[PDB]
Every structure is written in C-alpha cells, then in structure tokens.
Design a binder for this molecule. Structure first.
Ligand SMILES: *[C@@H]1O[C@H](CO)[C@@H](O[C@@H]2O[C@H](CO)[C@@H](O[C@@H]3O[C@H](CO)[C@@H](O)[C@H](O)[C@@H]3O)[C@H](O)[C@H]2NC(C)=O)[C@H](O)[C@H]1NC(C)=O
Ligand SMILES: *[C@@H]1O[C@H](CO)[C@@H](O[C@@H]2O[C@H](CO)[C@@H](O[C@@H]3O[C@H](CO)[C@@H](O)[C@H](O)[C@@H]3O)[C@H](O)[C@H]2NC(C)=O)[C@H](O)[C@H]1NC(C)=O
Ligand SMILES: *[C@@H]1O[C@H](CO)[C@@H](O[C@@H]2O[C@H](CO)[C@@H](O)[C@H](O)[C@H]2NC(C)=O)[C@H](O)[C@H]1NC(C)=O
Ligand SMILES: *[C@@H]1O[C@H](CO)[C@@H](O)[C@H](O)[C@H]1NC(C)=O
Ligand SMILES: *[C@@H]1O[C@H](CO)[C@@H](O)[C@H](O)[C@H]1NC(C)=O
Ligand SMILES: *[C@@H]1O[C@H](CO)[C@@H](O)[C@H](O)[C@H]1NC(C)=O
Ligand SMILES: *[C@@H]1O[C@H](CO)[C@@H](O)[C@H](O)[C@H]1NC(C)=O
Ligand SMILES: *[C@@H]1O[C@H](CO)[C@@H](O)[C@H](O)[C@H]1NC(C)=O
Ligand SMILES: *[C@@H]1O[C@H](CO)[C@@H](O)[C@H](O)[C@H]1NC(C)=O
Ligand SMILES: *[C@@H]1O[C@H](CO)[C@@H](O)[C@H](O)[C@H]1NC(C)=O
Ligand SMILES: *[C@@H]1O[C@H](CO)[C@@H](O)[C@H](O)[C@H]1NC(C)=O
Ligand SMILES: *[C@@H]1O[C@H](CO)[C@@H](O)[C@H](O)[C@H]1NC(C)=O
Ligand SMILES: *[C@@H]1O[C@H](CO)[C@@H](O)[C@H](O)[C@H]1NC(C)=O
Ligand SMILES: *[C@@H]1O[C@H](CO)[C@@H](O)[C@H](O)[C@H]1NC(C)=O
Ligand SMILES: *[C@@H]1O[C@H](CO)[C@@H](O)[C@H](O)[C@H]1NC(C)=O
Ligand SMILES: *[C@@H]1O[C@H](CO)[C@@H](O)[C@H](O)[C@H]1NC(C)=O
Ligand SMILES: *[C@@H]1O[C@H](CO)[C@@H](O)[C@H](O)[C@H]1NC(C)=O
Ligand SMILES: *[C@@H]1O[C@H](CO)[C@@H](O)[C@H](O)[C@H]1NC(C)=O
Ligand SMILES: *[C@@H]1O[C@H](CO)[C@@H](O)[C@H](O)[C@H]1NC(C)=O
Ligand SMILES: *[C@@H]1O[C@H](CO)[C@@H](O)[C@H](O)[C@H]1NC(C)=O
Ligand SMILES: *[C@@H]1O[C@H](CO)[C@@H](O)[C@H](O)[C@H]1NC(C)=O
Ligand SMILES: *[C@@H]1O[C@H](CO)[C@@H](O)[C@H](O)[C@H]1NC(C)=O
Ligand SMILES: *[C@@H]1O[C@H](CO)[C@@H](O)[C@H](O)[C@H]1NC(C)=O
Ligand SMILES: *[C@@H]1O[C@H](CO)[C@@H](O)[C@H](O)[C@H]1NC(C)=O
Lengths: 440, 163, 163, 163, 48, 48
C-alpha cells in the first residue's frame, strides 16, 4: 500500500500496573471520635458509579498486592496518632500489695491491688483500691507486666473502637479494577473485570484466627493461598454462611476515677456488683458442623480425599497467636478456641480471658491500657473465615492436620483486597493512518 | 469511562467516535470528590495525616495531566484530540496491514506491538513539527503574500504545499 | 481588575474590548505575593501552620484555573478568549431581544437570567464541537487519492494564502 | 539541554532549529526524579522534612510553567513555540542592525540589550493581539458595503505590507 | 501597596452575622496561641 | 588559597590540597559497655 502516516491519539484507554497513595471516603453521621476515620477523613462517599468492560481478561494478584501494605501502615499510623494526646501512666509502675477476691465461683481471676498514688499536689500520696486481672501483674509483691518494657499510655475514654467502614478512593489519573468472577481463587487472569472509583465498605477489624464481620463469598467456600505446596503458607478460607458468635462478659464493672497530679484522671476498675462469672462466647454446634463440612468438602479438591484432622493451635507465641483475640466494644477478649477443632473425615461455649494492658497490637514497645467499661458487655456478629496452616512433615499420604494459626494483621486485609487492583492510565497513543498534515 | 477498553481498535473506533470513550474527562473530573471536600471539615485534630498524602496525590495528578498537554503543544496538536503529523511511518519495522490493525486489534495489544520505538516516535514527531515546519513558516512571512506571484518562480509556494 | 463589573454588558462591552477587564491576568497573577515569599523565610520554628493552609489555597487556585482551560479545550476554543460555536441558540426559553441584552443588562443580571440550563448549554456545546464536527474533519482527509489532484479549488487556496 | 546557550543567536539559530535546544522538555521533564519516587518509600518515620520542601518546589515549578503558557495564551501564540505579532518594532530605542543581531550576539547579551522596556513590550503585545484584532474578528461575521468594497483603507491595507 | 478598585454600579448584599472570616480568624488566633505557648517551660513541679 | 579578601585580617583563609596526607587516629582502650535500666523501658548505656 501507500506509506501510512503516524497519528497521535490523546485519551487511548490503555493502562499499566502502578503504585500510589489512596485516601479515605466515609460518611457523616456528632460523636465522630473514631480512631480509624480520624474524625471523618473524607466524609463524602458519593454514589458508586461502576462500569463494566465486558471484553478484557486482566491478570490480578493478591499476594503481591500493594494496597494491603498501604492499609497496614495506615492503620498503625492512625492508631499511634489517636493514642498520642492521651494520659500517660508512668506514675503507675509501682510496687503493688495485692490479694485475692472472694465473692463468687472459682475458675475466673482478679487481684485486689492497692498502691501509693493519687499524687495530686506533688506532696500528698494516698492508698488507693484497684482491681486488676491476672495476665498483667507479675510477682517480685506485684508490679505491672510492662514496666520492664516501655511506658503505658492509656486510651482516652471518649474515643471508641467500633470499626466503621472505609472506602479507598483512587486519585485522578488512576483506576481501581475489580474482578467480578465469582470463582477467582487467588491469582491469575480474571475474565470479567469492572471499574469503580472506590471500593466497598471495608470494616477494618482486627481479629486473629477467625476474621469477623467480613464480606463472604459465594456458596463455594473458597480456598486462597500462595501455594499449597509450601507448608508455611497461610491458607485463608472464606465462607458463604454467616455463623454467629454470641459473645458476652457477665460482670457489671463499676468504674472509679482516680486523680493523678494536675488534671489527668485515671480510671481503675472499682468493686464490681458481686457476680463473678466467666467471660464466654457461644456458637451453635449444628451450623458449625455444617460449615466445617463445607470447608473440608472443598479442601479435598486440592489433594487426595483422605483423613483430614484439625487441632488446637500449638501455642507458645502469646495470646495473640494461640487464642482468638478481638475487642468487643472496647474490651479485649482472648478466647481458648480448642473446642472447635476435631477430626472431620468420613451450643458450644468458649472460655474467654480478658487482658487489660494490651501490647501494641503488632509491635513490641509502647503498650496501651484499655480503661474498663461499665455495665455488661455483649456483642454479636458473624464469622466469615478462618486462617489455617498445614503441618505436613512425614505425612506422605494420610492424616493431614490443620491448625488455626495465623498471627499477622496483613492477612485480614488480604481477605478483602483480593478482588482489587490499581492501574495507571497512559492516555497517549500513536497509530499509523492515511492522514498527513496540510503543510503551508 | 473505559467502557470499551477491551474492544479491538475497530470496535474502539467506537471509542474515538465518542470522547475517546470519556477518558480525558475521567482524568480531570474524577478529582471532584477530593475537590468537593478538602475543606468541608471544621475540626481541629491538631495534626493531619492526609495533609501530605492527599496533597501529593493531587499534585501528582496535576503534573501528569500537564505533561501530556505540553507534549501535545510541542507537536502542534494543542487542543485537538486527534491530529495528524508530517512524520511518515518511517523505516519503523512493525509495518503491517491496515485491515488488521483497525479491525482486529485492541488498544492494549497495540501497545504491546509498538512498546519499543515509542520514545523514537516521540523524538521523531517534533522534528517534522518544528525544525523544518516552523522554519518554513518563518520563511513564509519574509516574502509578501501577494507580491512574489509574478516571477513565474511560484513553485516555492508549490514546494511549501507538496513537500 | 473587576473595574466595570457593575456596568451593563453594553458598558461591559467595554470590559471585553479590553482584556475581559483584566480578569484572567488577575486570576493567575494575584498569586504573586505567595509566589514571592513562601521561601524568603529562613527560620526553623519546628512546625508550620501555613504549610497546609497556603498549600491547599494554592493548589485550589491551580485546579480551578485548569478546569476552565480544559473546558475551553473541549469546545475547540483553547487560547481564544472569545470564540463562537456551531450550537445554535436552541429551544432554550430565555429568547429575548438583542438590544435589550447587549445594551441594558449587567453580567450579574445576565447570570441571574440563565442560571438554569447552564449545564444544559455546557453539555450541548461539545456535541456540535465533536460528535459531528470532529467526525466531518475525519471525513475530510481520509479518501482523496486525488488530494494532490485538485483543479477548481486553487482560487480559494490563493485567496487563503494572502488572507 | 542548554547545549548552545553561550553561542551567538546565529549559532543559536541552531538552538531554535531544534527544540529551542530542548529547553521546554527540560523544564517539565526534569521533574521525573521527584515524579518517580515521592511514593516508593514505605516507611513511617512519624514526621516529614521533605513533605513541605519538595511540595513547595514542585508547585513552584508548576506555577512558573503555567504563567508562561497563560502569557502565550494572551498573545494568541498558544501552542506555537515561535510566532509573530502585529506589534511593530516601535519607537523602542535599541534600533540596530539585522546582521549584527542574528549573526554575532548571544541570547544573554541580547537580554542585556533589552533588559529595559521588556514589560513595555509585554504590555504592548496584547494590545495589538486583542483590542483591535479581536474586535476586528468580532466585526468579521457582519459588515456593510465596506467588507466586500470600501475602496479606501484597502490601498493602505495593501500599504501596511508596502511600508 | 493597597490597590483598591471601585465598581461604581453594583448593590451587593452583605452579611456580618453569617460571615465566614470571623470563624477563620478565631481558629487562627487560638491556634497561634497554642502554637506559641508550646515550647515554653512547664510548671507542674509548682503545684505544691 | 581562597579568601574573601586577604587585606582583612579577620577573614578565614581556606586552603585546599592536592595530596591526601593520612591521619592514623586511634583509641587504645577496650571500653566494655554496661546497660542501666531507668524506670520503664528506657535503657541507659554507661561505660563499664
Ligand atoms: C476425590 O473426589 C473427587 C470427586 O469429584 C475426584 O475428582 C474427580 O471429579 C470428577 C468431577 O470433577 C468426577 O467425575 C464425575 O463422575 C461422576 C460419576 O462418579 C459423574 O456422575 C459426574 O458427572 C462426573 O463426571 C470423577 O469421577 C472424579 N474422580 C474420581 C472419583 O476418581 C478425585 O479424583 C478424588 N480424589 C482422588 C485421589 O481420587
Ligand atoms: C459484630 O457485628 C456487630 C454488628 O453491629 C458490630 O457492632 C456491635 O453491635 C452491637 C449490637 O449487636 C452493639 O451493641 C449495642 O448497640 C446498641 C444499639 O442501640 C447501643 O445502645 C449499645 O451501647 C451497644 O453499643 C455494639 O456497640 C456494636 N459495636 C461494637 C464495637 O461492638 C460488632 O462490632 C462486630 N464485632 C466486632 C468484633 O467488631
Ligand atoms: C487458582 O486459579 C489459578 C488461575 O490461573 C491457577 O493458577 C495457575 O494455573 C495454571 C494451570 O492450572 C498452573 O500451571 C499455574 O501453576 C497456576 N499458578 C499458580 C500461581 O497457582 C491456580 O492453579 C489455582 N489454584 C491455586 C491454589 O492458586
Ligand atoms: C490466692 O489465689 C492463689 C491461686 O493459686 C493461691 O495460690 C493463694 O493461696 C490465694 N490466696 C488467698 C489468701 O486466698
Ligand atoms: C505506702 O507507704 C506507706 C508508708 O509507710 C507504707 O506503709 C505502705 O505499705 C505503702 N503502700 C504500699 C501499697 O505498700
Ligand atoms: C451460652 O450458653 C449457656 C448455656 O445455657 C448459657 O447459659 C449462656 O447464657 C449462653 N451465653 C450467651 C451469650 O448466649
Ligand atoms: C479490696 O480490698 C479492700 C480493702 O478494704 C476492700 O474494701 C474491697 O472491697 C476489696 N475488693 C473486693 C472486690 O473485694
Ligand atoms: C483450652 O482448654 C483446654 C481444656 O482442657 C486445654 O487443655 C487447652 O490447652 C486450652 N487451649 C490451649 C490452646 O492451650
Ligand atoms: C474431640 O472429641 C473428644 C471426645 O471425647 C473430646 O473429649 C475432645 O475434647 C475433643 N477435642 C477437640 C479439640 O475438639
Ligand atoms: C449494674 O450496676 C447498675 C448500677 O446500680 C445497676 O443499676 C444494674 O442493675 C447493674 N446490673 C446490670 C446492668 O446487669
Ligand atoms: C451478619 O449476617 C447477616 C446475615 O446475612 C447479615 O444480614 C448481617 O449484615 C451480617 N453482619 C452484621 C450483623 O454485622
Ligand atoms: C466485545 O467483543 C465482541 C466481539 O466478539 C463484540 O461483539 C462486543 O461488542 C464487544 N464488547 C464491547 C463492550 O465492545
Ligand atoms: C488484512 O488483514 C485481514 C485479516 O484481518 C485480511 O483478511 C486481509 O486480506 C489483509 N489485507 C492485506 C492487504 O493483507
Ligand atoms: C479476530 O478477532 C477474534 C476475536 O476478537 C479473534 O478470535 C480472531 O483470532 C481475530 N483474528 C485475527 C486475524 O486477528
Ligand atoms: C521491546 O522492548 C523490550 C524492553 O523491555 C524488549 O525486551 C523487547 O525485546 C522489545 N521488542 C519487542 C517486544 O518486540
Ligand atoms: C454605571 O451605569 C451608568 C448608567 O446609568 C453609566 O453611565 C456608568 O458609566 C456606569 N458605570 C460604570 C463604571 O460602568
Ligand atoms: C429591544 O429593547 C429596547 C429596549 O432596551 C427597545 O427600545 C427596542 O425596541 C427592542 N427591540 C425589539 C426588536 O424588540
Ligand atoms: C436601562 O438602564 C437604566 C440604568 O442602567 C435603568 O434604570 C433602566 O430601567 C433600564 N431600562 C431597561 C429597559 O432595561
Ligand atoms: C433556576 O434554578 C433554580 C434552582 O436553584 C430554581 O429555583 C429556579 O426556579 C430556576 N428558574 C429561574 C430562575 O427562572
Ligand atoms: C563558540 O563560538 C565559536 C566562535 O568563535 C564557534 O566556532 C563555536 O562553534 C561556538 N561553540 C558552540 C558550542 O556553539
Ligand atoms: C551589520 O553588521 C555587520 C557586522 O556584524 C556589518 O558587517 C554589516 O555591514 C552591517 N550592516 C548594516 C546594514 O549596517
Ligand atoms: C563577532 O564574534 C566574535 C566571537 O563571537 C567576537 O570576537 C567579535 O568581536 C564579534 N564581532 C562583532 C562585530 O560583533
Ligand atoms: C535598564 O534598567 C536598569 C534598571 O536596573 C537601569 O539601571 C539601566 O540604566 C537601564 N538601561 C540600559 C541597561 O540601557
Ligand atoms: C603512632 O606512633 C607510635 C610510635 O611508634 C606507635 O607506637 C603507635 O602505634 C602509632 N599509632 C598509630 C595509630 O599508628
């Protein structure tokens, strides 16, 4: 043919995979004192225009995604930002003379501690009642457990820890893809993609070993991993059925304010009303038996249909790795989930222990102090998936064992940013055509 | 927005029979959420996390949406979404069929075709836009428009309209 | 700057016989005070109050002074302060007198006249700028193996090269 | 980039036979290092020193690289690196030789020549670009007997080219 | 230098009880107060 | 030889070499370190 001529095109819809900063979008609803919304970071959240593309098989990845690292450093930065202007408690690390309590049943326990404090005008100290748990006092009679580690800044009691959903909206000149294929397992080409301006509601919960209040997939309980062949690779699993967790804490927990120096109060747990029972969580055994049936009946597709056993999580770690750790309206539970894992191959109570001095929920160093909550604490919501690890070893053929380990906080956010990917837009494209410019 | 990015360039001839399938207005007007409220907040909070992150995202989008306007300025194409050039399809070695390209090939596959030599084309275009075209236009005024045409040496005008 | 904003559009025909009464240069060149010294300070002070407030004001002014340039780009009017369009005055129902408008009505009263349908006009304009005008221009230079061969169009070309 | 800034404007006629010796692309594309990584860092560090200094440098470069585009817009030269004007070389008193200027004088010495009256020229240019040229274009959609045949000014209109 | 330009011909409506610049001035003054007071000497050993 | 002006006596005269003369510096002792705990988790290193 004839010699064609180059013709630029501005606005060609091509894209490359890139990495950039995103931002919030939430909604307004006063009392916006939330730790994760930083008092309504972007309170807009407009109408969600979603556009299909109908014709493109884009490759995705969830184990190389970038938005999970942005979400993780955003959450730890919002934590340390909200914790900053609250009361320090470095005058609390003192020698405590404690004794047991006796009003109710054994096997709970609490320690009735008293110390020299109430230091107000820098000259007068007082003997003060307080009522601490175990798991945050040690012997020498007693001191707090974090006094050989760092300082112990308490939370401001006006803020709350309810995980209101946030939405990551991309900046201009970038786009957020979204795989709609309901059987996209973990990674690869998704055949039917879509484009949104921003993601759905992401409740940024923090829960080990059983991720809560999640976005549950379809009736095929999906199995995600990096590769099943490696034994040290966390096997996420996602449900389709919201099994309920009726958790509670039975006592009444009067609060007692202590003045420390100038205007810095300190809230210590006073004398409770006098019914010491144990904190527990109920799950109905029928629906749990069925959802284990589904997870085990879609785990035999990945290897031979033989002898699946599950166990308690060999412990060590601390409570963060061994027990299901979560907070229920500002009170931090730790629940012994041995009683959910026996051998599936062919109502349930759970004892929960409560810590009060929490570590930095990933790191070592600074540690917060959760002030007590008045009344009876009771919160219910759904589980949405587990986090398992294979053991393997010399089990060359049978007795495959799974134990719900899993300790990192990133995998919770990989359980909802798997169907998303960020792309840059390169609007400038050239193409040979049959047009040539009128040269004057 | 992006609604036929997976189509072939013949079915994405459909895209550039509309506003390049709304790509440019989606570039600059998807700012409207962070344009609507970086300021609706009346709160102290004594420090700002987004005060650097949102600002960096914003000026990143602005400089990216100005480099392309300057590059269309440098090839005489400023304003025009689709314009033609005097640079020929050169010795550039992806010489192939017209009815293969604009009938059965997507924009992304086309980007995979000519991923090389793209900076060669970008360096090549302004050459014919400027180094002779601007110098011919500089010649075209240092001669009276209606006074040279008596010589019968009028080809210079013809030469400037063919080559 | 703004010196006859209260005048009628006939006495603000005076405004657009000058640089729209200096409006655009006052848009971009009133930045010159915060352009002259965001940097003349050599002081530590360990924190910055204006480091977010001035920056937000600055990039707000920049994105506002680019949306209008992009909107003039999308109606083929880029560069030109006053340009005309192919969109007719449509069925738009503020049909009234020429000697009423451009003799006795201020710009602000005129904004109060057509406060509605303004987004209708903005959606309407690019339609005639693009969807047929760009497609007619695309019809121009595709098929003419006989573009070198033109015999009865020389007269316009000669007129055009002088005027 | 800047490769013949010390040459005379005749040997820097060499500069504007290429892309003004790459000056504009070096203006906007030397941003590419702080464009490549203001974001590759994944580190907390709890505070930012560059979060104001880099941002101030960035928006300083952007407003400087937009004032010149707006000033080329205000003289009808938007897009065009080299354009001519209707303003004559006026009574401006550095009247000198053509073969002295564009043969033996550098750009910097030329800036030292006309360091005065530069704002006079900048105020002078838009006058002939707008106050009569835009008003003549506003006339050029309707006229009386004169537009086809005024038979007076036309000789002087030819005379402007003549003298 | 304070360039002031009249408009000669416009009756613009004003408001002082719905103005926005007073809230900006008030939060500016309290923020400048707490910013200047910050790096000075504490006196918590004085409460005796 | 660099200066601001040689005529002023209170003007520092920098000088720049062309030959890298070496400085073998040392400190001969061994300096065991000893960590001291101060309050909560703030160690303090004193020379043992
Ligand atoms: C563990 O069990 C699965 C069961 O699906 C075995 O995979 C193979 O799965 C296919 C379906 O994806 C089976 O085909 C089906 O056969 C039935 C008749 O039994 C027919 O009615 C269906 O329409 C379908 O065609 C296939 O039989 C099955 N292979 C078997 C059972 O050997 C998997 O192989 C089993 N694991 C091992 C180690 O064998
Ligand atoms: C599990 O899902 C629930 C669903 O909302 C999350 O929210 C918690 O829901 C309970 C109600 O079932 C709330 O308890 C009470 O709400 C009433 C409403 O009138 C209020 O008056 C009481 O003061 C009390 O708050 C509870 O507040 C609410 N939020 C929290 C943080 O517990 C729940 O968060 C989910 N679980 C986890 C671990 O996130
Ligand atoms: C999940 O689906 C993906 C879809 O691509 C599978 O990924 C690849 O599949 C091909 C063909 O089966 C294999 O050759 C590759 O080795 C797979 N890649 C990976 C990373 O697995 C994948 O097999 C499916 N299963 C899992 C557990 O990821
Ligand atoms: C307190 O409880 C602990 C729990 O083992 C026990 O060893 C101790 O004797 C108890 N002391 C009193 C006074 O009851
Ligand atoms: C507080 O100081 C007094 C001073 O004698 C001491 O008797 C008392 O035991 C101290 N408090 C505690 C908790 O030991
Ligand atoms: C859990 O089950 C026990 C068994 O009857 C019951 O007494 C208790 O109230 C239940 N707790 C919750 C929170 O439902
Ligand atoms: C703790 O000891 C004090 C000592 O008087 C007592 O008054 C208080 O009731 C005790 N707390 C409990 C829960 O028994
Ligand atoms: C949970 O309680 C059971 C009760 O026998 C105990 O044996 C088990 O060790 C506990 N779980 C863990 C993880 O230690
Ligand atoms: C498994 O079942 C046995 C039946 O006696 C029970 O004793 C045991 O506690 C169960 N273990 C787990 C981990 O569920
Ligand atoms: C908790 O204490 C309050 C305070 O009097 C009391 O009214 C209430 O009945 C107690 N019990 C609860 C909330 O179960
Ligand atoms: C839990 O599951 C139910 C049933 O689908 C759902 O309606 C609800 O929104 C879920 N989440 C809660 C209670 O937070
Ligand atoms: C996708 O490709 C098919 C060609 O088989 C075409 O018919 C269809 O219109 C395309 N979809 C879009 C949205 O362009
Ligand atoms: C161009 O490509 C099409 C297939 O897409 C083919 O049918 C046609 O014959 C080709 N034309 C030439 C001239 O090669
Ligand atoms: C034409 O397009 C279809 C689908 O778009 C594809 O299957 C086929 O291979 C293409 N043929 C050629 C010659 O490009
Ligand atoms: C295009 O450039 C890449 C550089 O990343 C090179 O690997 C490839 O061989 C080039 N040629 C093609 C794709 O024809
Ligand atoms: C204001 O309007 C009057 C019309 O009565 C006009 O004469 C005057 O020039 C106008 N002023 C300005 C500044 O345009
Ligand atoms: C236009 O309006 C003026 C009043 O401003 C009036 O004198 C004139 O007659 C009107 N012309 C028409 C054609 O209505
Ligand atoms: C003309 O303008 C004057 C002042 O600008 C005003 O008083 C008068 O009502 C106007 N008349 C019309 C017909 O607009
Ligand atoms: C113009 O739009 C406004 C909406 O704010 C409406 O109230 C009004 O009736 C419209 N029409 C006019 C002013 O003629
Ligand atoms: C410098 O000037 C001399 C004139 O003597 C010229 O020959 C030479 O090319 C110039 N150098 C450059 C880089 O323009
Ligand atoms: C212009 O200047 C050159 C020296 O650069 C000189 O040779 C020439 O004669 C001058 N021409 C006129 C007309 O003055
Ligand atoms: C011409 O240029 C050379 C070097 O660039 C210089 O030495 C000489 O003086 C110049 N002559 C004039 C007349 O400008
Ligand atoms: C140009 O302006 C400067 C102002 O800095 C003045 O000093 C000089 O005399 C002027 N004239 C020249 C350089 O011919
Ligand atoms: C310096 O010189 C002395 C003299 O012998 C020697 O003992 C010593 O080791 C030297 N120190 C170094 C650092 O070379």
């Amino acid at each position: 043919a004839e010699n064609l001529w180059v013709t630029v095109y501005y606005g060609v819809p091509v894209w490359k995979d890139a990495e950039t900063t995103l931002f919030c979008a939430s909604d307004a609803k006063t009392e916006k004192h939330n730790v994760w919304a930083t008092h309504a970071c972007v309170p807009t959240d407009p109408n969600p225009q979603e556009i299909h593309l109908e014709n493109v098989t884009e490759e995705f990845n969830m184990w190389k995604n970038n938005m999970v690292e942005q979400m993780h450093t955003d959450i730890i930065s919002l934590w340390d930002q909200s914790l900053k202007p609250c009361v320090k408690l470095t005058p609390l690390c003192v020698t405590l003379q404690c004794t047991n309590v006796t009003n109710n049943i054994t096997d709970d326990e609490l320690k009735n501690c008293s110390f020299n404090m109430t230091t107000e005008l820098r000259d007068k100290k007082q003997k003060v009642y307080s009522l601490f748990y175990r798991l945050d006092v040690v012997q020498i009679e007693y001191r707090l457990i974090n006094c050989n580690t760092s300082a112990i800044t308490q939370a401001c009691p006006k803020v709350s820890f309810e995980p209101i959903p946030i939405h990551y909206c991309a900046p201009a000149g970038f786009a957020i893809l979204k795989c709609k294929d309901k059987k996209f397992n973990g990674t690869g080409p998704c055949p039917s993609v879509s484009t949104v301006q921003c993601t759905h509601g992401i409740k940024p919960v923090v829960s080990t070993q059983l991720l809560l209040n999640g976005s549950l997939a379809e009736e095929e309980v999906m199995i995600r991993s990096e590769n099943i062949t490696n034994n040290a690779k966390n096997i996420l699993v996602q449900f389709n059925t919201p099994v309920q967790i009726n958790c509670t804490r039975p006592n009444n927990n009067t609060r007692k304010s202590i003045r420390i120096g100038p205007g810095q109060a300190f809230y210590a747990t006073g004398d409770i009303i006098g019914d010491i029972r144990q904190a527990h969580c109920n799950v109905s055994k029928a629906t749990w038996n069925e959802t284990l049936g589904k997870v085990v009946k879609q785990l035999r597709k990945h290897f031979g249909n033989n002898t699946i056993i599950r166990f308690a999580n060999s412990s060590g770690g601390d409570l963060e790795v061994t027990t299901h750790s979560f907070n229920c309206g500002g009170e931090f539970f730790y629940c012994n989930t041995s009683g959910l894992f026996n051998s599936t191959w062919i109502s349930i109570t759970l004892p929960c222990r409560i810590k009060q001095i929490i570590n930095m929920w990933q790191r070592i160093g600074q540690a917060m102090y959760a002030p007590p909550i008045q009344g009876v604490i009771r919160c219910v919501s759904n589980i949405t998936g587990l986090i398992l690890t294979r053991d393997g070893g010399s089990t060359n053929s049978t007795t495959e064992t799974f134990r719900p380990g899993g300790g990192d906080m990133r995998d919770n956010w990989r359980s909802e940013l798997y169907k998303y990917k960020v792309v840059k837009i390169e609007p400038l494209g050239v193409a040979p055509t049959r047009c040539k410019r009128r040269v004057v | 927005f992006l609604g036929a990015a997976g189509s072939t360039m013949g079915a994405a001839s459909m895209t550039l029979t509309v506003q390049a399938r709304n790509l440019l207005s989606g570039i600059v007007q998807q700012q409207s959420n962070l344009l609507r409220a970086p300021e609706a907040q009346q709160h102290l909070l004594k420090l700002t996390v987004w005060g650097i992150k949102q600002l960096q995202a914003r000026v990143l989008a602005v400089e990216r949406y100005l480099r392309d306007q300057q590059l269309l300025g440098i090839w005489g194409c400023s304003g025009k979404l689709i314009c033609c050039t005097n640079v020929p399809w050169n010795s550039s070695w992806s010489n192939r069929n017209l009815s293969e390209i604009w009938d059965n090939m997507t924009w992304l596959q086309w980007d995979k075709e000519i991923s090389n030599y793209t900076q060669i084309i970008y360096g090549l275009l302004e050459e014919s836009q400027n180094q002779q075209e601007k110098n011919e236009q500089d010649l075209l005024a240092l001669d009276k428009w209606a006074s040279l045409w008596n010589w019968f040496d009028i080809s210079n005008w013809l030469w400037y309209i063919k080559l």
